[PDB]
Symmetry: D2
Subunit: 209 residues, 4 copies
Amino acid sequence: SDKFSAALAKNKEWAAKCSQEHPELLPTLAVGQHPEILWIGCSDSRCPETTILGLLPGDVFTHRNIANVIHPADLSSGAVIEFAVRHLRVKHVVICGHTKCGGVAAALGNKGLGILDPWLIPLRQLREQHLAELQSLSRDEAVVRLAELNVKEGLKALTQKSVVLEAMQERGLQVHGLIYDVGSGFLRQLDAAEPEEALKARLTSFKTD
Amino acid sequence: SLSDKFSAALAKNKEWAAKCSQEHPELLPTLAVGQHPEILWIGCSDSRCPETTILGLLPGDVFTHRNIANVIHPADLSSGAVIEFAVRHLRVKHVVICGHTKCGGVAAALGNKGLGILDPWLIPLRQLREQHLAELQSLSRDEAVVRLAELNVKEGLKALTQKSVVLEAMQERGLQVHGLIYDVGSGFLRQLDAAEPEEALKARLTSFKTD
Amino acid sequence: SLSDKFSAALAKNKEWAAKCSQEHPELLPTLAVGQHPEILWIGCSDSRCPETTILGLLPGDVFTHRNIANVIHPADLSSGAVIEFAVRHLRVKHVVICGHTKCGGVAAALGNKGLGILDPWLIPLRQLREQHLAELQSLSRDEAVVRLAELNVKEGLKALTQKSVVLEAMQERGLQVHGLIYDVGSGFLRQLDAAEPEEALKARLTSFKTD
Amino acid sequence: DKFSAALAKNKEWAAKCSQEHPELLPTLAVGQHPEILWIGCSDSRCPETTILGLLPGDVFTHRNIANVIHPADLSSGAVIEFAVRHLRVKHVVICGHTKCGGVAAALGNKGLGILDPWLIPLRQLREQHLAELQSLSRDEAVVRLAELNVKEGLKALTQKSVVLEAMQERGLQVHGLIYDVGSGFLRQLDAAEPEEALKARLTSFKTDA
Ligand SMILES: CC(=O)Nc1nnc(S(N)(=O)=O)s1
Ligand SMILES: CC(=O)Nc1nnc(S(N)(=O)=O)s1
Ligand SMILES: CC(=O)Nc1nnc(S(N)(=O)=O)s1
Ligand SMILES: CC(=O)Nc1nnc(S(N)(=O)=O)s1
Ligand SMILES: [Zn+2]
Ligand SMILES: [Zn+2]
Ligand SMILES: [Zn+2]
Ligand SMILES: [Zn+2]
């Protein structure tokens, strides 16, 4: 069965249902978006943000990439963060990793993957830093642990951006780390504690005028 | 409201997980064994274009990349890595590039306001604006936004087919590529005609196919 | 030891520092006060194209960026940051893009061997190969390398003039841009004619100059 | 006109070079075999071939603002891959310099447009070493951050499989230098890392055969 032609038919059925059951929603969204959440998650087909959050179109500004990696100088994630934080003024930035992330699993192996190798470098940087801890775990346990370390490192890379530090001080922007369990459907919050003195050093080092 | 949208979203997630356990208890545990999506979706980050919702599909159906204005920069590692993985490893049957009506990324490229880090990101849209300037200036402002959104999807399909991994999959298994526009006002997807002369793809094969 | 090129280079550095102190004792201390180069050079990393040597110039004269095959990716931060700094802050009067004969980067783009991380880097040369394929196929292999090297310089000058900082400097203070080919066999630089129809530069100004 | 003057000086240099090293340019035309890859600053005061007292063909060169190695940068990535795997250079040199205004800009808090994402790695080092940098004078902090940047660059360089392979297979060496723009001297940084550091890097980054 052609999944593309099947998807177009299901789109038309969904759009007609939306007109019947929430007739104001799509026309009000056409006037302009006002999402309160920026979601940075994995491209993994099992992590569709709006479905797993039980939300609607217009609720979640979304960036998805392999293993939800934030490269500090990546223009793709950089442009979405600039737009979502400065222009849409989202109240929340969520970084969501997930269980059974094959990107994280690839980083724990040493098989050459072409253009994927430079993309996964930040996961291999965390692997080197945390090697003794990761080697003490089973492969399945290491995949969860490195997925968590990657979310926490992402929150650090996110808060190293002046536009985020500005929004946190000016209008109480909040940032959050999650792990999605692909087997249960539950989001879990990471404790993601950093000393107060961590954000002070970051403000000094990264906030610009 | 007075409601924290983050804590409200976690509560709704638990309600959705409860519904999955009650109505389709096999689905999430079978997906945890491994994904097998047949579709790679490259679309806009715009909150109004959630691919799995608007396609009426489930988790596991759509491998997804979303960025500002669904732009494919040829040497971007972010889109590059997702295309390599989806095409070579997951062996998707379809790559969809979906633009949308009222794309403010496309609209920003038709303006000349300095937007900081967004300026280098939108360069491919300004390249299309320069190439098609006479055509775009002959339209109304709102028609030029729709037209540039279409040209951007078509240019994205060209950038996509400049990748050896995609040309190989098109030859080896008839991987298909599709250009769509999402109408944020109606919820309908429409297909772009997106024909290219045969001699276009032959020159591309010669110029970009790699061992 | 005596065959180590690195320890030999450090010894030659100390000999060069001694020569500077003996022959031009004011030069290095006056440069330490601040640089004022009038030229930004964008050239190939090729060991045969050291800009300051081949121009017969001194330290402080040439602000320099060198990469594989002197390629300007429009959204590359590495070349982007050097252009912003050289044009807006140092206020260079000249931006030079220098290609060269026997550029193996240009030759690699005319081949179809997979080269790992070099593949995405060379995409702009394969874009030119696809656009100019009939012309390149009508030439010998060696002539196609020279022609693609020239097209690459000219395309770089286009990418350079798509940047508002360059367009601003050209309009406000007569910044000039130049395309060169370095002949690695003779040591001579030759200028490329690099003329563009008037309507080309007007569309670029409209599409890329910031308000 | 500095540009037309430079083209005239080029022609004079090429004619002189045919007299003084009559066969050098012709040997160069048949191919290049440099033994050194130089990664340095774009600063007009740091021309590698001049300050090393070397000739064309001796130094494969990459220069960027503040000699920064972004791990997933294709520009520096492509030159390292080509120089190490194809030319088989014996030495990779990362050269920082005194009075580097790129390093100085990272110690400031002015917004600089497209320069901001480029300088993030220097601001990462500033945050990590902030107590040490704040304890120094302005001019001493610039020298210190320039040194930390070279050392961090050598770490990013050795996180690349192509470099780790060459070090193991053929004793490729990597070196950190600071160029003094006022004296003309290169000095070597001690750049010591525990043995356990390079073992974790090999485990985390070297691609399987
Ligand atoms: C090599 C590689 O990237 N493998 C992946 N496996 N799953 C991935 S996911 N969770 O990003 O879809 S990526
Ligand atoms: C400056 C800029 O990028 N503006 C945008 N407006 N909407 C965008 S969208 N459709 O990508 O959400 S981007
Ligand atoms: C594979 C590849 O890139 N080959 C090269 N040959 N010479 C180059 S040069 N002129 O940039 O040094 S690049
Ligand atoms: C803001 C900025 O980049 N300023 C610079 N000053 N000197 C530089 S150098 N040493 O790279 O030429 S960069
Ligand atoms: Zn994943
Ligand atoms: Zn959009
Ligand atoms: Zn070259
Ligand atoms: Zn410098």
